[PDB]
Amino acid sequence: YRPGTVALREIRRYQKSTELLIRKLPFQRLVREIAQDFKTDLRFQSSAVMALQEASEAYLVALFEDTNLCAIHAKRVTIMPKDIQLARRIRGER
Amino acid sequence: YRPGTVALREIRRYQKSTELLIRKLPFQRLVREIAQDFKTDLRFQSSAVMALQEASEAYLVALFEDTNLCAIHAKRVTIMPKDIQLARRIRGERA
Amino acid sequence: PTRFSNRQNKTVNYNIDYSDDDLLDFHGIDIVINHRLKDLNNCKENYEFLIKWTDESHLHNTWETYESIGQVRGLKRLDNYCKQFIIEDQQVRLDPYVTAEDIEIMDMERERRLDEFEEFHVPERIIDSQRASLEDGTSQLQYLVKWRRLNYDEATWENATDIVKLAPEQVKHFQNRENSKILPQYSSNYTSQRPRFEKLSVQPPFIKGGELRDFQLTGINWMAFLWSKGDNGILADEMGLGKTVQTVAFISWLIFARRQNGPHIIVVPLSTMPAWLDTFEKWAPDLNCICYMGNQKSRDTIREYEFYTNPRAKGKKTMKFNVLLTTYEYILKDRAELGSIKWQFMAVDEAHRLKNAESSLYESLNSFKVANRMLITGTPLQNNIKELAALVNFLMPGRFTIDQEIDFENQDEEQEEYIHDLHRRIQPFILRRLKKDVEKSLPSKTERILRVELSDVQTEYYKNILTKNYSALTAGAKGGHFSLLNIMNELKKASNHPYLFDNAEERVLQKFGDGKMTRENVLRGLIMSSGKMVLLDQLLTRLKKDGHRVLIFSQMVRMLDILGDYLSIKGINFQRLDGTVPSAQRRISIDHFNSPDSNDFVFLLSTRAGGLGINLMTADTVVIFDSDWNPQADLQAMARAHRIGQKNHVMVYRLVSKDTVEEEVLERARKKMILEYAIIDMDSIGESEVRALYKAILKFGNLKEILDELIADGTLPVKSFEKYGETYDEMMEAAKDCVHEEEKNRKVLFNFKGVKSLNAESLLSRVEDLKYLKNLINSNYKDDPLKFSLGNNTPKPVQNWSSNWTKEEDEKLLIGVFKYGYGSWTQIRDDPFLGITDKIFLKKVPGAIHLGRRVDYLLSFLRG
Amino acid sequence: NIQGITKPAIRRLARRGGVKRISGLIYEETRGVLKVFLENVIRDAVTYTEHAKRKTVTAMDVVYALKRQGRTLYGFGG
Amino acid sequence: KRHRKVLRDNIQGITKPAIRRLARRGGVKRISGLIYEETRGVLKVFLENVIRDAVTYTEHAKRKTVTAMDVVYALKRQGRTLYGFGG
Amino acid sequence: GKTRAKAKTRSSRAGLQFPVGRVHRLLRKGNYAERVGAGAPVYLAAVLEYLTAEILELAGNAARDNKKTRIIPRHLQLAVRNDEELNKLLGRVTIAQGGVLPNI
Amino acid sequence: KTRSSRAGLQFPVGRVHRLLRKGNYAERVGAGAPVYLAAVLEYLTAEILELAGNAARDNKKTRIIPRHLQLAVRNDEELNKLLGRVTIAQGGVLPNI
Amino acid sequence: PTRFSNRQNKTVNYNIDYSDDDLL
Amino acid sequence: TRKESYAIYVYKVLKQVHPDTGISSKAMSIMNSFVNDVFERIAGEASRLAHYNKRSTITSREIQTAVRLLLPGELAKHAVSEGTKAVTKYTSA
Amino acid sequence: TRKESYAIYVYKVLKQVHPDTGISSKAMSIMNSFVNDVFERIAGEASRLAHYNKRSTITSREIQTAVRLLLPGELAKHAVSEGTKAVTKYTSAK
DNA sequence: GCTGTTCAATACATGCACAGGATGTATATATCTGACACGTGCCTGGAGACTAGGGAGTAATCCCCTTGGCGGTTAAAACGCGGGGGACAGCGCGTACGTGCGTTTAAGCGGTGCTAGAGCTGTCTACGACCAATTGAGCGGC
DNA sequence: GCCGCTCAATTGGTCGTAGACAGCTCTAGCACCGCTTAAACGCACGTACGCGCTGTCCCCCGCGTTTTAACCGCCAAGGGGATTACTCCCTAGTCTCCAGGCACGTGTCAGATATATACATCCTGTGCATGTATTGAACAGC
Ligand SMILES: Nc1ncnc2c1ncn2[C@@H]1O[C@H](COP(=O)(O)OP(=O)(O)O)[C@@H](O)[C@H]1O
Ligand code: BEF
Ligand SMILES: [Mg+2]
């Protein structure tokens, strides 16, 4: 393939697919770490963790879409942290 | 006064007060026209028009805040239509 | 359709498929093996490196240096090797803290690494042969070689004329496998009823490797008896009584005596794949036994070359191999590939894994279309009765269904009735013998369980766990948030050793007079911080002075980390085996520990990976550092010492932390143990047959002695030997008579059984010539035919043949005809011991007819 | 009509939003966005008014239409 | 060894290439190396303020097991309705 | 426009496939009001049937043109997000194992 | 003698209990529910009027007016998070200062 | 001063009065 | 445990719109969630319309107006047509 | 219509915190809307809390958790303390 | 008379054609697999029928609020011009991101084994509604 | 600001149902090991993209004048909303019976796949024909 295409090849692949993109075990450990601040020794029904992963990945994907629109508005092509901050502030996510 | 200061002076003046900023009768005419397209011979309780103006102006002010953040993000000071279109698209109003 | 939308949407295309076509085998370094004298620039100037190349075997290893290498792929691997060498040399030469024994270890490491690579250039089997056309327009015979200790990836084509010099025996084995008399397509078909069986009084002569014991003959007799009735069963002999030997001997008997050659599958626990395969190589070396393992490419290569005769055939493909050894993992990975085969026999080693009828292994194996099944397990562990029922249902689908699932209580009248009925009802299909009954030559085992007091660090941990003292536990973690979702696990961890917790060692080295570099005091903490370590050191010191050697089992790999560090700091030589250790390294570790010169004193073993099927009879002591919830896993560990190969009294120590959960685990194991004790045409000849017999006679001459082999290898259809003798004699007599009639008319084509155009003179001449050849070769050199020579007798020269041909070529060609018969030019040219293999061609002068007529001339001349 | 929302009114609104400079194209954008917002609110307000069988739109059903938009407004009742 | 293991941190279990894949599905061509720690912060904030509500529902029920239903309810409170887990 | 209403089931009297009995029970058990008129569950079951038929029609079109015989969440997502009005109805809903719309 | 004064509340517990019935929020409403709810309403009302009273004093005014309620709410992070989606009539903006 | 709230609020200045002497 | 779902009625409507196609269990749980959500939306808005008018009863007029509030565009007027047709059949039958 | 209002009680609460100040009628109507809105949001959440648990009754337990869901941070902690104090003093009276 | 060379006859060696045997290919037939239909049983929810009370619907009246017009004044809005500042484009340079490669680590799936927690069932008691009567507070007007 | 009147809250008692408490059973959740393989991480290098800088031109903002419209006040009339009263119909509640849906097993039908049989083509072996070389005999010359 031509140089530099692989970014487009990845975009095309990952937009076609539907699987969860974060590894399941790391995410489950993060969820349990976070939960233990609110109540110690909670158990989790496994579908609860899958629902949290589905929701958080859909959230991050939509946030990256808005961040990309912010970067394009700068007339960059690299997304920068201030693009995420601008997207979240206009969303009112603060 | 220093050159070009008056814009910031206006920013101070309008942020400090609480006045409604659109003329009342023009906005009432606009509301009448839009309602007339939905349903003829409607009547409006005057407080209904005041409530509708207050919500409309609060919405426009918050939209211009988001637009100004989009302009600043472009290393720019003049707000441009594409800033409004970006703010509205991010805040979910492209509908 | 019946509903239709009335919304005026435009049409949409939802097709998400796309193509990215709008966006549209080299001599690299593979491995660096060793280095010798000719910073990194000192590496370039001083040193020369042994390079293994990509696409080439370890025979093609070359010494090289940077200027000799130049620029090539893989040079970064040479940079990394130089960097590692630099670090090794700095630690060896520079480091003033390096010890004498550390220097010895660093020198031993050179041997340890090189002793692996010294295997990889030795052939283990030839897989296949080809003729490769060269750009020179000639062709070279090549053998696809699989190297020792390598998978079937990095199997490599090699010059056959080299491999025959390197590894003659493996080429002979390959030729035997190609000439195999026991290929699955010739399998007998006792589809209606199998022949009756008489007890074997002594082991069949085809059992090569050694002598079976009387109880092993009895087991084979029982297996054969059950097979004749059509019954599946269990080999339940106590662990280490030769169930592997009995299984190999039974499969050998089934193939040779019954002629049920055919694909037999044996599914085996990974750690025991070598021992199974080494048993086949000793006890049944004539079997084509394949081991199915390794990465996708390796086993794809196994399927491609090894499985099929004519792998490119496109209907009812048939199998080249007698036995496939496979690990449980690959019965899941390659379920579709293996499940497609018409398996004749299945044996499962350590069958108790099947005890969960819901397991994917059970579903997979139970879907295989195998004709007969066999389970091997020393512990048909009735951990509950439903788990035994799953095994029996696996043997007996839709037959002898155990639906009376109710568990036995300690006492009921219905319980004693049902247990006694079950016991007598199962007994026909389970064969079990015990070491004390079978083999009084075994020295006894004995077991002692040692009560151990908790250390104070353990005592405070165990208290904090019971009181859920999350704050004190978090301080014991230095802010790592403790959790108690499985209190039982944390209590067992505290009972074994506090260094299993994140900062219990930090909390004692904070007695900084013990801390940091202090060799003595790091060990002092590591030992005194738990009672089991104190007792273990007392035992290990005694055992070291006595000269015993000890296997130490644990149900926690981090405990084996702690023990391994403790032993390394005391400088003890030890091996380790847990399920993270790859197959080759564990193979090496077991071979080394069983080596009679081995210095290793301790073997650290995981109870799961190391408790099953290993042979470690060169140890005599076992420490079960913590007990399992299942007693049979501990008995399996104890059996790893107590093999049939034992030669000294075996001493087993359990370590039990007193006043802890460990004793509750002991009591539940004992209750399950006591529950387990409580349960414990032929004459019809057609035209095709006459034509085949005539061609066989013209190939081999007199067939009447070989005829058993010719029927076995498919040269002739299955028919009575007497009728082939009769038809041979009749054909020879008719040929003689027709020649006599030709002579009387002259003072030879004839018809036989309606076959036309048979030549009489060819039969008589070929029979005379091959009889003379056979008698000459057997009379001169029965024992070693390659030494045969024609002496002074020199025939006429070759008629301008394009290849150098001499008395030597005539001799070797006659040896080829002696081995393969007349007309077998493919085998004669392919057999690399004859050296002709380059000389003979398919427009070329030495054609098949030319060589045939040369052989006939030579045989006439030697008769003359 | 919409053109009664004058250029300086939009300036004043932008000044309260802190806008330092304002392109001459922003006025027709702002008029469009305002018209869309008013249409979305008045549709629901009139729907509540007509369901009540009234002919007078009231501050209360405007407040309900805004509560539907997620834009609840204090100080008009409700 | 006994003691050489490094625990990393659980938020670091959301790896750089996982964020790369999420950005790819979002259509991002090119991505500054600072975006990873920002994305981890944003994720932690979202997942905290969802899990707090889920645990509040679990504790009001006097359960000890968080269930897919009170996750779905916690998300519904945020206006992030999720289909496919019941509810 | 007409139906025989031969069956006792109130859905059949309405001509609906959806369970008017359930919709009435749920309206009554849900504390939506003190009282529930007899026409409410018929109207609501009819609207639920219409919306589910509309989604399943578009999802079946998407499954067909992707050349698969079963509707899967990928196809529900494609149907919803390609339809302006279903997307405006479900503009705050996440569909499990749905993707995004591919850029094209 | 009122139910409010037994709890010590200024807000009408009887009114809250009547509203909890009228709204048909559930089949039953417990006796403690309207006391708790009236107490929470009283607390939030007091905290709002506290901050608006401060804002009125800082602006040197005797009456609290919507400007002061807007200032009080928007300057507090928590009240601003409670009232984030809320528009206050005749409120201004926070000045940039 | 009969009622107080225990909230650990920061101090705030609410005075909106302003001057333009920095613009002069 | 036991639970109950629209699945059989979703199958019935599917076989009315695409008789040859199937539907996955996951997709069926999506459709069940969608039906429950839209039901709760329409019922909750009809409840609010009743309370705003001091009515004690939810009628077809409440459901109709809730549908006109909740559904966008043509999807509303078609749903209202299906509802008024079904109520007409139910009354005349 | 004898319209219900909180005004007299907002006045009584005002005079506990700032007895010197008064309150404008407009600001009073904004306080009235605020009280109604917070009441409706808490009662709604307590309602669906009861429904989720298949209980028929709204108790102090439901109001307490509806407050912990609805109110942010320390504002919740103090509101819950005020509510439990009032319920205790009520329960220890006639 | 014997030897060497030439001539003639015969045998071997090669090429081509025909026959025979094996392999590949296509079609027909039968078996295998999966799904649906039908029968039976059980349990639960809906449907049908009857009764009573309350809610809604209808009608009438009264009052308030909204709409429309008129007039004057003042401030805001609109038009027009000029100058300066900011936006946009082009260019150059340096750093950061991305691509390749080698090596290591950890995820995923399968299994093992136990225990706690969830869910269900049954019983009993207290709390909440409903109804009636009495009392005190809040609104409205003087 | 205070007093009078009306409506809602409070008080008491009774009845029925919901919730609380206890016990039991089974499923699913937790931790850890085995085994393989792919993904992730470390490291280097090169190019492209981001950002700074500069110049030019166009557009916006400031200022002045003029013009228009909004706002405020006042008056008038009619319509619509709200309230009150009465009556009828609709829905809730109760009881009883039927039907549908869950649930499983079995058989038959439908569709696909595999195997068997027949025919065609290609490859190999053998036989016959032709050419060339070899062998044997005779003739010629020394
Ligand atoms: N017939 C025999 N002759 C000599 N050694 C034997 C024989 N049978 C078994 N062994 C020894 O036993 C060891 C194998 O143990 P094995 O009995 O196969 O384990 P198990 O049967 O418990 O799986 C081998 O190393 C071998 O030396
Ligand atoms: F059971 Be044996 F030791 F493999
Ligand atoms: Mg074994």
JSON list of N, CA and C in Angstrom, two decimals, chain C residues 844-857:
[
{"chain": "C", "resi": 844, "resn": "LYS", "atom": "N", "xyz": [15.88, -38.64, -22.67]},
{"chain": "C", "resi": 844, "resn": "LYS", "atom": "CA", "xyz": [17.13, -39.07, -22.07]},
{"chain": "C", "resi": 844, "resn": "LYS", "atom": "C", "xyz": [17.41, -40.54, -22.37]},
{"chain": "C", "resi": 845, "resn": "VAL", "atom": "N", "xyz": [18.70, -40.88, -22.41]},
{"chain": "C", "resi": 845, "resn": "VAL", "atom": "CA", "xyz": [19.18, -42.17, -22.89]},
{"chain": "C", "resi": 845, "resn": "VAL", "atom": "C", "xyz": [18.86, -43.29, -21.89]},
{"chain": "C", "resi": 846, "resn": "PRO", "atom": "N", "xyz": [19.14, -43.12, -20.59]},
{"chain": "C", "resi": 846, "resn": "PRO", "atom": "CA", "xyz": [18.84, -44.19, -19.61]},
{"chain": "C", "resi": 846, "resn": "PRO", "atom": "C", "xyz": [17.37, -44.23, -19.22]},
{"chain": "C", "resi": 847, "resn": "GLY", "atom": "N", "xyz": [16.51, -44.55, -20.19]},
{"chain": "C", "resi": 847, "resn": "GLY", "atom": "CA", "xyz": [15.10, -44.73, -19.92]},
{"chain": "C", "resi": 847, "resn": "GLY", "atom": "C", "xyz": [14.78, -46.04, -19.24]},
{"chain": "C", "resi": 848, "resn": "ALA", "atom": "N", "xyz": [13.51, -46.18, -18.86]},
{"chain": "C", "resi": 848, "resn": "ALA", "atom": "CA", "xyz": [13.05, -47.34, -18.12]},
{"chain": "C", "resi": 848, "resn": "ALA", "atom": "C", "xyz": [13.32, -48.64, -18.88]},
{"chain": "C", "resi": 849, "resn": "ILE", "atom": "N", "xyz": [12.98, -48.66, -20.17]},
{"chain": "C", "resi": 849, "resn": "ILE", "atom": "CA", "xyz": [13.23, -49.85, -20.99]},
{"chain": "C", "resi": 849, "resn": "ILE", "atom": "C", "xyz": [14.72, -50.09, -21.16]},
{"chain": "C", "resi": 850, "resn": "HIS", "atom": "N", "xyz": [15.51, -49.02, -21.30]},
{"chain": "C", "resi": 850, "resn": "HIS", "atom": "CA", "xyz": [16.95, -49.17, -21.46]},
{"chain": "C", "resi": 850, "resn": "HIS", "atom": "C", "xyz": [17.57, -49.83, -20.23]},
{"chain": "C", "resi": 851, "resn": "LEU", "atom": "N", "xyz": [17.21, -49.35, -19.04]},
{"chain": "C", "resi": 851, "resn": "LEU", "atom": "CA", "xyz": [17.70, -49.96, -17.81]},
{"chain": "C", "resi": 851, "resn": "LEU", "atom": "C", "xyz": [17.16, -51.37, -17.60]},
{"chain": "C", "resi": 852, "resn": "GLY", "atom": "N", "xyz": [15.90, -51.62, -17.94]},
{"chain": "C", "resi": 852, "resn": "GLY", "atom": "CA", "xyz": [15.38, -52.98, -17.86]},
{"chain": "C", "resi": 852, "resn": "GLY", "atom": "C", "xyz": [16.15, -53.96, -18.73]},
{"chain": "C", "resi": 853, "resn": "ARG", "atom": "N", "xyz": [16.36, -53.60, -20.00]},
{"chain": "C", "resi": 853, "resn": "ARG", "atom": "CA", "xyz": [17.14, -54.45, -20.90]},
{"chain": "C", "resi": 853, "resn": "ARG", "atom": "C", "xyz": [18.59, -54.59, -20.46]},
{"chain": "C", "resi": 854, "resn": "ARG", "atom": "N", "xyz": [19.16, -53.54, -19.86]},
{"chain": "C", "resi": 854, "resn": "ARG", "atom": "CA", "xyz": [20.48, -53.66, -19.24]},
{"chain": "C", "resi": 854, "resn": "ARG", "atom": "C", "xyz": [20.50, -54.65, -18.08]},
{"chain": "C", "resi": 855, "resn": "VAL", "atom": "N", "xyz": [19.47, -54.62, -17.24]},
{"chain": "C", "resi": 855, "resn": "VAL", "atom": "CA", "xyz": [19.37, -55.59, -16.14]},
{"chain": "C", "resi": 855, "resn": "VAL", "atom": "C", "xyz": [19.24, -57.01, -16.68]},
{"chain": "C", "resi": 856, "resn": "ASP", "atom": "N", "xyz": [18.38, -57.21, -17.68]},
{"chain": "C", "resi": 856, "resn": "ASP", "atom": "CA", "xyz": [18.26, -58.53, -18.29]},
{"chain": "C", "resi": 856, "resn": "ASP", "atom": "C", "xyz": [19.57, -59.00, -18.92]},
{"chain": "C", "resi": 857, "resn": "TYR", "atom": "N", "xyz": [20.29, -58.10, -19.57]},
{"chain": "C", "resi": 857, "resn": "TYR", "atom": "CA", "xyz": [21.61, -58.43, -20.11]},
{"chain": "C", "resi": 857, "resn": "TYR", "atom": "C", "xyz": [22.58, -58.82, -19.00]}
]
